[PDB]
Coordinates of C-alpha atoms and ligand atoms in Angstrom, one line a residue:
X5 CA 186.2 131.8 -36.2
X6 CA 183.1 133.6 -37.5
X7 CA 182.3 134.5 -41.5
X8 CA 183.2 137.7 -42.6
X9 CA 179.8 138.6 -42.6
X10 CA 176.0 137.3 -41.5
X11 CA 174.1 139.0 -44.2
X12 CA 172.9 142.2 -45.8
X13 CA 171.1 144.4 -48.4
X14 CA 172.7 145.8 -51.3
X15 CA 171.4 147.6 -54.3
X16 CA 172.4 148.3 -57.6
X17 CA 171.0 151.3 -60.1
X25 CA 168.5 152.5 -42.8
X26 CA 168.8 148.5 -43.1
X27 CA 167.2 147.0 -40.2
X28 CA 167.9 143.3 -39.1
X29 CA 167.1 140.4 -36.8
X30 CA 170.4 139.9 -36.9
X31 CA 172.7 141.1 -34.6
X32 CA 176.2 142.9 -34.9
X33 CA 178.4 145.8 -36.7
X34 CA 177.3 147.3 -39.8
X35 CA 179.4 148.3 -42.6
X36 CA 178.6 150.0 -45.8
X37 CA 180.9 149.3 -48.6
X38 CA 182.6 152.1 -50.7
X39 CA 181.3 153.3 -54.3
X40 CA 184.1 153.2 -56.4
X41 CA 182.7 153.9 -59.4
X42 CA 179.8 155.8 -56.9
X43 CA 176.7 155.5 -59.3
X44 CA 177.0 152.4 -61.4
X45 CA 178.0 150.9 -58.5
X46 CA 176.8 148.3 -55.9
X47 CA 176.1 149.9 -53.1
X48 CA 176.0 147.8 -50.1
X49 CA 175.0 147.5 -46.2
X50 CA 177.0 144.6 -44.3
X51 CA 175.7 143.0 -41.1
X52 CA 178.4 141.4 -39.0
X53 CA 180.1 140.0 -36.0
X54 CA 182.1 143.5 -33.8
X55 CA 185.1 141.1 -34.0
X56 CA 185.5 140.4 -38.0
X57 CA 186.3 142.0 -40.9
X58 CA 183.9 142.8 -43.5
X59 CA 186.9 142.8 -46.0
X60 CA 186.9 138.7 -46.5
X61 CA 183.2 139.7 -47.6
X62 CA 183.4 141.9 -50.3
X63 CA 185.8 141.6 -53.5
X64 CA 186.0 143.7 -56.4
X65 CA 187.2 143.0 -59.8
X66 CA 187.7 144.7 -63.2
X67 CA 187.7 141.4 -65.2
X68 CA 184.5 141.8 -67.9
X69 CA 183.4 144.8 -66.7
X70 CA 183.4 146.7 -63.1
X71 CA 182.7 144.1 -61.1
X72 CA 181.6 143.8 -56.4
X73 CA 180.9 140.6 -54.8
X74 CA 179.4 140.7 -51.4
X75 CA 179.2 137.3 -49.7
X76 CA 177.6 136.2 -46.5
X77 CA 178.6 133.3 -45.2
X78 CA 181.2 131.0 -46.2
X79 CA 182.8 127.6 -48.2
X80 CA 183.3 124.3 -47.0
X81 CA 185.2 122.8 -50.4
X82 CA 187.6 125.8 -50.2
X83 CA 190.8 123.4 -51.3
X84 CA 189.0 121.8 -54.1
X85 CA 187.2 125.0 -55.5
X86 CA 191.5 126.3 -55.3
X87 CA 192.4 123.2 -57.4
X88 CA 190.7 124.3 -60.6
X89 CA 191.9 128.0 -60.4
X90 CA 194.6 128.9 -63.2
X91 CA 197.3 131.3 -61.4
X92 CA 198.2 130.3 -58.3
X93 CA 198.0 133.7 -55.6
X94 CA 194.9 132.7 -54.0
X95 CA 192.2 134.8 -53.4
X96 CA 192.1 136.4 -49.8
X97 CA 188.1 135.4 -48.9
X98 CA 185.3 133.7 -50.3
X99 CA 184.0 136.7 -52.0
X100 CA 187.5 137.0 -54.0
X101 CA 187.2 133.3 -54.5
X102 CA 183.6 133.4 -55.9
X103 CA 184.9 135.9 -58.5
X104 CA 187.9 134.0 -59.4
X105 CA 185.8 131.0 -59.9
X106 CA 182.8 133.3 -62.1
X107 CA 185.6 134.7 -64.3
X108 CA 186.1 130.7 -65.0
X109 CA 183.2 129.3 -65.2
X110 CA 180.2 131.7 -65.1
X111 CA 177.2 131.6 -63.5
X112 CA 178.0 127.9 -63.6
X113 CA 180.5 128.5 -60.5
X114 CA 177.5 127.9 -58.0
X115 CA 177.4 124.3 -59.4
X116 CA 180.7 123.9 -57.8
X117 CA 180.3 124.9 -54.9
X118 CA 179.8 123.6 -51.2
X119 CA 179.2 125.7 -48.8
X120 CA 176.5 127.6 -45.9
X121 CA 176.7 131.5 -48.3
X122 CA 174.5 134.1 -50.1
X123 CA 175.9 136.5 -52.3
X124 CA 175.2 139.0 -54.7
X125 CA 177.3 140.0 -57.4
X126 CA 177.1 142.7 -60.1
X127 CA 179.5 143.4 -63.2
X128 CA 178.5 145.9 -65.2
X129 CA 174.7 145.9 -65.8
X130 CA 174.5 142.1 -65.3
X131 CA 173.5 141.2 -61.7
X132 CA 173.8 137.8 -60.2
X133 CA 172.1 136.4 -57.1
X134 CA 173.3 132.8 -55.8
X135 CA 172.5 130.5 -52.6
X136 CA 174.2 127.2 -51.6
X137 CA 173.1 124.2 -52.7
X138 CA 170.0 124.2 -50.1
X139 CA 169.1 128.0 -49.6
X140 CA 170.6 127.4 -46.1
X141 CA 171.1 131.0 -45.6
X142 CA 168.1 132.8 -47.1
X143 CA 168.6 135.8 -49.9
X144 CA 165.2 137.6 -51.0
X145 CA 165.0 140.4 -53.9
X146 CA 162.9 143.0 -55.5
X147 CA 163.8 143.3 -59.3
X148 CA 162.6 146.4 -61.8
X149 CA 163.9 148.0 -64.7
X150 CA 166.9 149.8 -63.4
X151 CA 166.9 149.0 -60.1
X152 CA 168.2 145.3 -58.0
X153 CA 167.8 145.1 -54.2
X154 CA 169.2 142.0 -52.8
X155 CA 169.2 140.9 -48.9
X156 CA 169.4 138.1 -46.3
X157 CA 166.4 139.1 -44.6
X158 CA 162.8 139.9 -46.7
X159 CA 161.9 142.3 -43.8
X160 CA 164.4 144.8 -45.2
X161 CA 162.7 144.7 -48.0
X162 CA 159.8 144.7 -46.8
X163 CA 160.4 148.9 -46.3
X169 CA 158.3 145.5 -57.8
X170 CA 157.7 143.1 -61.2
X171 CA 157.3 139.5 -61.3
X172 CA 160.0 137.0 -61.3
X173 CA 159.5 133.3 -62.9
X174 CA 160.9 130.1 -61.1
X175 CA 160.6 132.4 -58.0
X176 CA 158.2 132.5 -55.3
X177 CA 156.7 135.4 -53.7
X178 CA 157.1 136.3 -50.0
X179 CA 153.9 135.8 -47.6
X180 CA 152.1 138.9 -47.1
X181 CA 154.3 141.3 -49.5
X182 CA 154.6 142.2 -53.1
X183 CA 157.4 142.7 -55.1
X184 CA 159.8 141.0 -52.8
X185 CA 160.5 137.5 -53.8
X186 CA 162.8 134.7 -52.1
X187 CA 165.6 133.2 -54.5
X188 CA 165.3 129.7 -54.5
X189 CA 168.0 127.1 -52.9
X190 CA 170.4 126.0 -55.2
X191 CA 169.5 128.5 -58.0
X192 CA 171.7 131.5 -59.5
X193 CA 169.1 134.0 -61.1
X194 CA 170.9 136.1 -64.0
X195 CA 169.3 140.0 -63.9
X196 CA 170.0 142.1 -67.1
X197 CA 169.6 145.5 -64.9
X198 CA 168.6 147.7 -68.3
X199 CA 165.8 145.5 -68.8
X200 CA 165.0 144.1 -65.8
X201 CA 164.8 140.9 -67.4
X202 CA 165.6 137.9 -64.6
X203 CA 166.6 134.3 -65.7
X204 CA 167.1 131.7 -63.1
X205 CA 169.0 128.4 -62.9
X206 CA 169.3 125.8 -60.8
X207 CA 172.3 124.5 -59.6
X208 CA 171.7 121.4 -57.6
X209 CA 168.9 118.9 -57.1
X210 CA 167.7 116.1 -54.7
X211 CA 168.8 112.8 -56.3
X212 CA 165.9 110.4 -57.5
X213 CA 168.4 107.3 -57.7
X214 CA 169.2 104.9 -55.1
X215 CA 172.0 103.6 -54.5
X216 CA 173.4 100.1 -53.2
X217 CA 176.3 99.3 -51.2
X218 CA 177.4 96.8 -48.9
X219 CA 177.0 97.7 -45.2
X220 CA 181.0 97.8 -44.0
X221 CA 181.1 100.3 -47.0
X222 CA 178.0 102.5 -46.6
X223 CA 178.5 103.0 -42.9
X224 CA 182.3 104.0 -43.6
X225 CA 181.4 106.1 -46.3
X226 CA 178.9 108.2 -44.2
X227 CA 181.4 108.3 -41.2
X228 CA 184.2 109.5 -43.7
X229 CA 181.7 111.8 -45.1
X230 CA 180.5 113.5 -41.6
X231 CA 184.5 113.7 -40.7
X232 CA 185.1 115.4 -43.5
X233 CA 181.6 118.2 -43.4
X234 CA 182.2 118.3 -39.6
X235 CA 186.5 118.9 -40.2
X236 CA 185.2 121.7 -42.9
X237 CA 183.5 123.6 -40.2
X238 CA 185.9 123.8 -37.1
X239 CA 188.1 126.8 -37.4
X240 CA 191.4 125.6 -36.6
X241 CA 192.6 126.5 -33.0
X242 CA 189.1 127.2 -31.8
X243 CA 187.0 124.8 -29.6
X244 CA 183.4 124.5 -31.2
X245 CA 180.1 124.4 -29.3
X246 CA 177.7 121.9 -30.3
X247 CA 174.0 122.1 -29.1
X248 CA 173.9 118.7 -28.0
X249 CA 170.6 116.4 -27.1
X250 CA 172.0 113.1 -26.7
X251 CA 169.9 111.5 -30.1
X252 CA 172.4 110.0 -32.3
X253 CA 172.3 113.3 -34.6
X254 CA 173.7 115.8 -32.5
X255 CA 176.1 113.1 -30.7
X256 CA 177.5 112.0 -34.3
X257 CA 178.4 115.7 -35.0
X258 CA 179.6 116.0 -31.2
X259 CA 182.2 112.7 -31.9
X260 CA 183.1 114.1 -35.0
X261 CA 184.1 117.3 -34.1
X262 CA 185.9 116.2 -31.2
X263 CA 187.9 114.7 -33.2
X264 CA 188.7 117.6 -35.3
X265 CA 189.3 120.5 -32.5
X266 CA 190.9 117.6 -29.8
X267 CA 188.3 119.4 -27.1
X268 CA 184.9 120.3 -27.2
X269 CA 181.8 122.3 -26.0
X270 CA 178.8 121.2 -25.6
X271 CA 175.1 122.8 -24.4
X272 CA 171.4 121.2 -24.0
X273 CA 168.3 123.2 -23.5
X274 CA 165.1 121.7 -21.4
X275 CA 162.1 123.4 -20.2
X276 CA 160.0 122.3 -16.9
X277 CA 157.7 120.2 -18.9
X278 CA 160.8 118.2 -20.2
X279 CA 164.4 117.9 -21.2
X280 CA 167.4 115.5 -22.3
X281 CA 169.9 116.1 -20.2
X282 CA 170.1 112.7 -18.9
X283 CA 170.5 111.3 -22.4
X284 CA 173.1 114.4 -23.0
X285 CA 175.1 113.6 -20.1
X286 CA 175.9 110.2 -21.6
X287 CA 177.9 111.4 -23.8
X288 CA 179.3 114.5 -22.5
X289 CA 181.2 111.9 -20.2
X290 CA 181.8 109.7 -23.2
X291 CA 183.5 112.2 -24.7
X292 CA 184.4 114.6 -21.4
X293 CA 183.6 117.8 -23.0
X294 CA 182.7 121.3 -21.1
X295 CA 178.8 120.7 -20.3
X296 CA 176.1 123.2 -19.7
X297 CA 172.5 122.2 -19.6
X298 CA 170.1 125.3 -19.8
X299 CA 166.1 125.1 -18.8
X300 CA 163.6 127.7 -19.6
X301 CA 160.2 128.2 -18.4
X302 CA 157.4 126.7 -20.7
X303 CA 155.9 130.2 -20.4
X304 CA 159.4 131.5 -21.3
X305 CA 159.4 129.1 -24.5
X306 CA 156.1 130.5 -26.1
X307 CA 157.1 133.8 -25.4
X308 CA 159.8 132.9 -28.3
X309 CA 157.6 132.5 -30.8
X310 CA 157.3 136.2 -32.3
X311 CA 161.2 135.9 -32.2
X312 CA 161.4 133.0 -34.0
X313 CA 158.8 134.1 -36.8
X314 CA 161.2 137.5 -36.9
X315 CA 164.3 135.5 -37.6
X316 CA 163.2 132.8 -39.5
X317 CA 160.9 134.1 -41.4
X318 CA 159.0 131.2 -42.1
X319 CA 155.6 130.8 -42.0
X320 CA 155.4 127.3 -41.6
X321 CA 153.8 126.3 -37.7
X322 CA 155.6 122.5 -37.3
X323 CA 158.9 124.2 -38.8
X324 CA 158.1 127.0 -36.6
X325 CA 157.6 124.9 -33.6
X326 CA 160.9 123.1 -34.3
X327 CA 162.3 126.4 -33.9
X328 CA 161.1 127.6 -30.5
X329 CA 163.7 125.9 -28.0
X330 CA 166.5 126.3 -30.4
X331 CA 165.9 130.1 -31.0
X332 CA 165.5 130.2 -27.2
X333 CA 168.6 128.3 -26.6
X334 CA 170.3 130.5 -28.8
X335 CA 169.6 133.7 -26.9
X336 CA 170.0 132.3 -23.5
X337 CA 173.4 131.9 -24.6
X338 CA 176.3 133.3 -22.3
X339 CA 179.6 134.2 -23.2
X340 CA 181.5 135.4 -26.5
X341 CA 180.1 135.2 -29.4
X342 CA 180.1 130.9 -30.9
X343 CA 180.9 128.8 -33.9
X344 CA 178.0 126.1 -33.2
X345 CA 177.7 122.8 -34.8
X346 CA 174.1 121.1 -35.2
X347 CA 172.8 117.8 -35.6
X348 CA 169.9 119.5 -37.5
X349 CA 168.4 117.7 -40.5
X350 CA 169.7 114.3 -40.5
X351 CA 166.3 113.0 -40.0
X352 CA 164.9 114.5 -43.5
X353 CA 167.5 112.2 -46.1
X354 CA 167.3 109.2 -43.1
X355 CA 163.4 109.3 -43.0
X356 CA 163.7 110.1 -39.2
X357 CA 160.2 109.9 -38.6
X358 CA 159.4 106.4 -40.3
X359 CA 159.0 103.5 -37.8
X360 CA 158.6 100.3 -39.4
X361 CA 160.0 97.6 -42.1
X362 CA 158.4 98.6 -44.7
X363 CA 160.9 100.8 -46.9
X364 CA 158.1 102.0 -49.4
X365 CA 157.0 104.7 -47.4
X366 CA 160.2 105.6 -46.4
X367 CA 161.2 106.8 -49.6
X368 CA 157.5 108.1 -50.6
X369 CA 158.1 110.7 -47.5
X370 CA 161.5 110.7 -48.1
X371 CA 161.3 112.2 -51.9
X372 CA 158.3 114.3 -50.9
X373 CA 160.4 116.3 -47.8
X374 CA 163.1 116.6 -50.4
X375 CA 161.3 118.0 -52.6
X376 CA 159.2 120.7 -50.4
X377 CA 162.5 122.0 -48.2
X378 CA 163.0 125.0 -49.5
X379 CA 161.2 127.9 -48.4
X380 CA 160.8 127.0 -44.8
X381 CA 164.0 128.6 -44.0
X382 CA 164.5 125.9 -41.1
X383 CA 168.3 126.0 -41.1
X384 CA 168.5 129.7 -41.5
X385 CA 171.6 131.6 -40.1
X386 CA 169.7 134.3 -38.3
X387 CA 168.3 131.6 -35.8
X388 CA 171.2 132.0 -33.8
X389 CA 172.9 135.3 -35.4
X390 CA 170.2 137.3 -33.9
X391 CA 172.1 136.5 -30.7
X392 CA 175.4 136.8 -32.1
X393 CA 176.0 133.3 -32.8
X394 CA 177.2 131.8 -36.1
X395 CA 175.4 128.2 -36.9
X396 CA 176.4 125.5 -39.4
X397 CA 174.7 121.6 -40.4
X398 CA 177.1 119.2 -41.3
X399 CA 174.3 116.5 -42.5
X400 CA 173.0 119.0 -45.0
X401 CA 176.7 119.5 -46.0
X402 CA 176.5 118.6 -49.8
X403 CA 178.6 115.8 -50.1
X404 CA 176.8 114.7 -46.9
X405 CA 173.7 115.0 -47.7
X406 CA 173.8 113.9 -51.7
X407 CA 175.7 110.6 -49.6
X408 CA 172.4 110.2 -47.5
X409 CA 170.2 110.9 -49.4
X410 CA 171.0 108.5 -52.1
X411 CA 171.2 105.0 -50.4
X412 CA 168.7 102.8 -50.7
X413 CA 165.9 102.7 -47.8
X414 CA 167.5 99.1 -46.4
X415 CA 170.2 101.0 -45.5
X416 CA 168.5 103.7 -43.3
X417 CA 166.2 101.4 -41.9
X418 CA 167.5 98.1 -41.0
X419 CA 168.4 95.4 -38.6
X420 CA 164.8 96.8 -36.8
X421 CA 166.2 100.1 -36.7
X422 CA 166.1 103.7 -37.7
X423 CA 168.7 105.5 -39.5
X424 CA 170.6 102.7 -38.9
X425 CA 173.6 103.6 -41.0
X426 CA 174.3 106.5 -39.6
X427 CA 173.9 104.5 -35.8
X428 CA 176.5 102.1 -37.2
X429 CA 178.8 104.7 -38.5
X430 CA 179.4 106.3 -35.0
X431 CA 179.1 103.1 -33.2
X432 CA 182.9 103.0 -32.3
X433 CA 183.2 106.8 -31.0
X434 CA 179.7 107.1 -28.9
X435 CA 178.3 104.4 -26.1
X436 CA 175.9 101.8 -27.1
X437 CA 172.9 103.6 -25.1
X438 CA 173.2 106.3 -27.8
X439 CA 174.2 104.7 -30.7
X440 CA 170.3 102.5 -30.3
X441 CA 168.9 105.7 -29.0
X442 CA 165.6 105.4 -30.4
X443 CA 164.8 109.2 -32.8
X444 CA 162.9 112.3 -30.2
X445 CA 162.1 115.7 -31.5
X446 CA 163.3 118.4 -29.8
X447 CA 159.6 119.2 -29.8
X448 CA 159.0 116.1 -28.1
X449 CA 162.4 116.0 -25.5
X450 CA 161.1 120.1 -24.7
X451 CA 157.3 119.6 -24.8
X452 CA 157.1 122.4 -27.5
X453 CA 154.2 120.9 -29.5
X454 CA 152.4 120.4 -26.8
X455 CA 153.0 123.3 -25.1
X456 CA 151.7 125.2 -27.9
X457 CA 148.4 123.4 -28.7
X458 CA 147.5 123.5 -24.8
X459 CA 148.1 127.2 -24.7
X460 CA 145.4 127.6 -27.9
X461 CA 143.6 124.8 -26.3
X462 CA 143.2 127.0 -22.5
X463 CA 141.6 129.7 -24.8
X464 CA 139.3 128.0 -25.9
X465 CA 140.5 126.6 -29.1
X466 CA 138.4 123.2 -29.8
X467 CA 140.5 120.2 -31.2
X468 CA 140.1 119.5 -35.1
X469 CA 141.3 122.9 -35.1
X470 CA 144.2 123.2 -33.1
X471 CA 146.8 123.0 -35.9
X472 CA 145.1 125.8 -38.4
X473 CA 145.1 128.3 -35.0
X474 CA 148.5 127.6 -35.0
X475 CA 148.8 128.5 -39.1
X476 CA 146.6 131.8 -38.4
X477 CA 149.1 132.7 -35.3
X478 CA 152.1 132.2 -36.6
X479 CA 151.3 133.7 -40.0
X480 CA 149.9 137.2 -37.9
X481 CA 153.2 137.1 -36.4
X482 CA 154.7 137.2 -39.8
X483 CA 152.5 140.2 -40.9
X484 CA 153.1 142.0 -37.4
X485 CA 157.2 141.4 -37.0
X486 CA 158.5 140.3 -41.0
X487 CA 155.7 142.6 -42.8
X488 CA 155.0 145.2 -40.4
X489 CA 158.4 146.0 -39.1
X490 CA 157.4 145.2 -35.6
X491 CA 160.0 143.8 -33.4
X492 CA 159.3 141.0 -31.3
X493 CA 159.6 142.7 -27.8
X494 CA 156.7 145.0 -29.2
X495 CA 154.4 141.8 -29.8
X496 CA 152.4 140.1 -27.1
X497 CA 152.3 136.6 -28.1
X498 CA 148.7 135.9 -25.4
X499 CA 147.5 139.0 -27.5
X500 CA 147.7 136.9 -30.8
X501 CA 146.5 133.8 -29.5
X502 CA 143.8 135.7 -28.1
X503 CA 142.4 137.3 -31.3
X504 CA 143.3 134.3 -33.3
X505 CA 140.9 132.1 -30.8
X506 CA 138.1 134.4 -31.0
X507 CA 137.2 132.2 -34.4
Ligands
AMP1 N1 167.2 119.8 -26.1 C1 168.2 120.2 -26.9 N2 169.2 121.1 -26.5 C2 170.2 121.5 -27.3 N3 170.3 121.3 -28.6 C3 169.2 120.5 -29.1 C4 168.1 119.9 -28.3 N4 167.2 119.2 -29.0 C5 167.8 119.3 -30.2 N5 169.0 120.0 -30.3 C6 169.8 120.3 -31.6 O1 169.0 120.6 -32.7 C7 168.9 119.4 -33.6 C8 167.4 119.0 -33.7 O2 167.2 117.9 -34.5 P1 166.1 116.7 -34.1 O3 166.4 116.2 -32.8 O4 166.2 115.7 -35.2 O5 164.7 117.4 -34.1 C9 169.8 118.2 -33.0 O6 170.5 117.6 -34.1 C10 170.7 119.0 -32.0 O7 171.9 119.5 -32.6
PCX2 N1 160.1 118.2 -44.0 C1 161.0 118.9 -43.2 N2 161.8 119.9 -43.8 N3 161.2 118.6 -42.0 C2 162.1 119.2 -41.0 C3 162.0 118.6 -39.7 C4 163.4 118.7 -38.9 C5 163.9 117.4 -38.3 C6 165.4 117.3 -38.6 O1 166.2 117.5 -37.7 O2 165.6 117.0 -39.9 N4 163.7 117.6 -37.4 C7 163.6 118.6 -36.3 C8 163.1 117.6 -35.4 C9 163.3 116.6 -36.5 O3 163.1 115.5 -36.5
MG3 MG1 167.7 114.6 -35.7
MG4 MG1 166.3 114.6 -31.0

């Protein structure tokens, strides 16, 4: 149901995380020229699935967190035909093929860290959706899911540099960087890249292709036997994803969050009957929500305030959680290839924003594992699935935004499977259904915090939350959020 592991910090030559669960470190075989290892994972899985070793080129230890979607197809191009046990073992099968250039083949929500010999190699999926940060010097790799536990030296090129640290740098999405460890030498590729193109297709065939496409992600992601939980908010996002993964587990969970300012439940509720799945609608305090926001900075890392503030109720959400541990599904990111936030006819700016939010993703950490792992929870986004999101991201602006409507052909694709009130549902975001943006600027705005202004209080508070629980070791419960506003408002 869950990967084999969430994340962790290895080095080759007292790991504390925001996520939450067992720890396991690997064994040394060959104790010294080893890589040495510190798993974080769920109490009820096996690190094993995680880590592979291998004598083919050298000495070789994979450690994986995460997992593959295109598991079937990566199979398909292996030579002998006893199939590797995890995705770690596949990686290596795959690297033994094809190099380095395995990463361009693959599909899938992973970080991993591999080293053979003196030769150390550091790979993300296709859109860094599960964060991997390192510190590189002559003799000496460290390599984790979480920059605060590196946070406890030389420069790397076609990296960028953590806020507020040195040394420590984040590995880009899509990108396998290639670390000679004698002389610290670091050469990085990319594996994947936005498309520029557009393409055209009629609509019949676009809106089945995306439908097929969102099966297929959605199908990738249910563990067989195991009803899913989707955080449902009744947009046509979250509902696709619900529909789809009905479909694929025959039964299905669902779960909405509110505060007292506002909430979706009504437009939730729709299609929890549409669909009859188990339905539990969850609504904290506003005062409860803000109170998040140290936690959120912790986890995700980012210091971006809108992605930040995107974050609040789902972080909250997360936590507030009940039961055994979850496999969730999200509707998160369709909006970014459809150009959720354009509302008119005119396709020109569609793309312009569209291109531009492409090509400025990475870093913000917004899909990051730890969101909900920090609770226990695994999380997975079937519209930035690859084959999804290449699909989306490609067709031509009349298709996203047509017939007076947005993200139109994803509306028509789940037209049969969801009821016409949510299939038109006009686009809300969840800082907008939650009050969360608002929220937020009147909390700066009862301290005093003038207007034209609001928005750079909100930069200077979230990036001291970063110094205080990301730089400065400082877990969230230790960090009055009023404190921070408080100081930041003084200017
Ligand atoms: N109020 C909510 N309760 C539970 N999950 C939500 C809520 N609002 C949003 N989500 C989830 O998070 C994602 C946010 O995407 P968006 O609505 O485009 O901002 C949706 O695709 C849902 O899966
Ligand atoms: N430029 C970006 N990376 N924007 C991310 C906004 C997230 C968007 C989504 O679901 O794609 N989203 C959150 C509410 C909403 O809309
Ligand atoms: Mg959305
Ligand atoms: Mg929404």
């Amino acid at each position: 149901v869950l990967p084999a592991a969430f994340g962790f910090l290895a080095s080759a030559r007292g790991p504390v995380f925001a996520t939450r669960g067992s720890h396991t470190d690997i064994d040394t075989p060959q104790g010294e020229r080893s890589l040495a290892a510190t798993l974080v994972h769920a109490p009820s899985v096996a690190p094993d699935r995680a880590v592979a070793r291998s004598l083919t080129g050298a000495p070789t230890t994979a450690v994986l967190a995460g997992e593959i979607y295109n598991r079937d197809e990566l199979l398909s191009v292996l030579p002998a035909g006893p199939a590797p046990e995890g995705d770690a073992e596949l990686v290596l099968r795959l690297l033994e093929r094809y190099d380095l250039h395995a990463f361009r083949l693959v599909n899938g929500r992973f970080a991993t860290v591999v080293r053979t010999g003196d030769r150390v190699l550091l790979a993300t999926d296709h859109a860094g959706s599960v964060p991997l940060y390192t510190c590189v010097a002559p003799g000496e790799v460290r390599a984790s899911t979480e920059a605060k536990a590196l946070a406890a030296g030389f420069p790397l090129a076609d990296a960028r540099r953590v806020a507020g640290l040195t040394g420590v740098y984040q590995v880009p999405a899509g990108a396998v960087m290639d670390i000679d460890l004698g002389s610290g030498t670091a050469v990085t590729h990319r594996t994947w890249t936005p498309g520029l193109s557009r393409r055209i297709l009629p609509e019949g065939e676009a809106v089945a292709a995306v439908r097929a496409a969102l099966e297929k992600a959605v199908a990738q992601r249910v563990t067989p036997g195991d009803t899913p939980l989707v955080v449902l908010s009744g947009g046509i996002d979250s509902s696709g994803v619900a529909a789809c993964a009905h479909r694929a587990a025959g039964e299905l969970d669902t779960v909405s969050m509110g505060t007292d300012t506002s909430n979706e439940f009504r437009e939730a509720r729709a299609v929890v009957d549409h669909l009859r799945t188990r339905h539990r609608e969850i609504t904290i305090p506003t005062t409860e929500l803000l109170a998040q926001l140290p936690y959120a900075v912790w986890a995700s890392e980012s210091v971006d305030p809108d992605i930040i503030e995107y974050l609040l109720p789902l972080t909250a959400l997360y936590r507030a959680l009940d039961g055994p541990e979850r496999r969730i599904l999200t509707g998160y990111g369709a909006d970014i290839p459809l150009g959720g936030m354009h509302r008119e006819d005119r396709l020109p700016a569609l793309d312009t924003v569209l291109a531009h939010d492409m090509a400025t993703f990475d870093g913000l950490n917004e899909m990051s594992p730890v969101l909900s792992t920090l609770a226990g929870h695994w999380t997975t986004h079937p519209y930035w699935d690859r084959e999804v999101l290449d699909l989306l991201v490609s067709l031509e602006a009349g298709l996203k935004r047509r017939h007076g409507r947005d993200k139109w052909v994803l509306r028509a694709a789940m037209a049969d499977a969801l009821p016409a009130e949510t299939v038109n549902r006009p686009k809300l975001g969840v800082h907008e259904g939650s009050g969360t943006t608002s929220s937020f600027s009147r909390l700066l705005l009862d301290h005093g915090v003038a207007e034209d202004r609001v928005h750079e209080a909100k930069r200077q508070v979230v990036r001291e939350l970063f110094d205080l629980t990301v730089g400065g070791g400082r877990h969230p419960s230790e960090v009055d959020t009023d404190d921070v506003v408080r100081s930041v408002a003084d200017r």
